[PDB]
């Protein structure tokens, strides 16, 4: 209850669950949501449907702080990244713009076996 | 590096006659020059093994040229070494 109106929406997707965090004009988080935030427990958390329901909740909760316009930022790629974006797009918040800010190393740390095997 | 001057200097310095760009003396001269430089470089960078080979070969080509000389005209030989300061 501050009344931000316009803010930023951060969508963090992964193949294990998605998670939206609605922030304000300079970065500080207002509300946040995830597949876990909603019902979904384990595997089910990843699913793009969850993305949608987490995306909504993310905004609905944002609406409270009087949100209206938001800028989307997408970190990651996975089980339902887009859906989240689309879910927001409707929500009831004007999507000023979307942007892929996914982090990439310029080759720094040897990844766990899990992600190596390549070169 | 060996400046162009540095080079020619040594060249005229040994040349058997005006224009002698590559007699056995000149060559032993120049080779000795490069060696000593490189050898110096290696007192430091003792880990720069890759450049060591270069030396290893320069030494080779030199000691191999001198052999030819000594065999051909033993006089010039002595003259060259004593001068240059090779052996020991």
């Amino acid at each position: 209850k501050r009344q931000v109106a316009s803010g930023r929406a951060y969508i963090h997707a992964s193949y294990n669950n998605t998670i939206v965090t609605i922030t304000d004009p300079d970065g500080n988080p207002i509300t946040w949501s995830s597949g876990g935030v909603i019902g979904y427990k384990g595997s089910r958390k990843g699913t793009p449907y969850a993305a949608q329901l987490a995306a909504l909740d993310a905004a609905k909760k944002a609406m409270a702080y009087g949100m209206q316009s938001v800028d989307v930022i997408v970190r990651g790629t996975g089980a339902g990244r887009e859906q989240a974006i689309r879910a927001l797009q409707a929500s009831g918040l004007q999507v000023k713009s979307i942007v892929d800010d996914t982090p990439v190393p310029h080759n720094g740390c040897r990844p766990k076996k899990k992600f190596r095997k390549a070169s | 590096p060996i400046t162009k001057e540095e080079k020619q200097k040594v060249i005229q310095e040994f040349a058997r006659f005006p224009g002698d760009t590559g007699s056995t003396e000149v060559q032993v001269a120049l080779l000795t020059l490069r060696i000593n430089r490189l050898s110096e470089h290696l007192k430091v960078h003792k880990k720069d093994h890759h450049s060591h080979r270069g030396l290893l070969m320069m030494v080779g080509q030199r000691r191999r040229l001198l052999r030819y000389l000594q065999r051909e005209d033993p006089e010039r030989y002595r003259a060259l070494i004593e001068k240059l300061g090779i052996r020991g």
């Binding site: 997408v74 974006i85 713009s97 979307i98 942007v99 892929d100 800010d101 310029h106 | -």
Partner: protein, 73 residues
């Protein structure tokens, strides 16, 4: 296809060794601070080879970017 004009065609006489012509170098970076592939830069093995360095100098000096955020998505 990748055919949208060669970044070389749309240009003039430029010193590829000039690590400060932000104006022109800016032309070879993608929609990110990435060095465009020859198949877009239209340069040659030797040219594209120097460009690379020259661009990297710019980055360091602080003139050219290392990477941009992507818009749309």
């Amino acid at each position: 296809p990748s055919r949208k004009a060669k970044v070389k065609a749309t240009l003039g006489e430029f010193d590829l060794r000039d690590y400060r012509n932000v104006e022109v170098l800016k032309r070879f970076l993608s929609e990110t601070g990435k060095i465009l592939p020859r198949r877009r830069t239209g340069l040659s093995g030797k040219e594209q080879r120097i460009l690379a360095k020259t661009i990297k100098r710019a980055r360091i000096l602080g003139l050219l970017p290392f990477t941009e955020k992507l818009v749309r998505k």
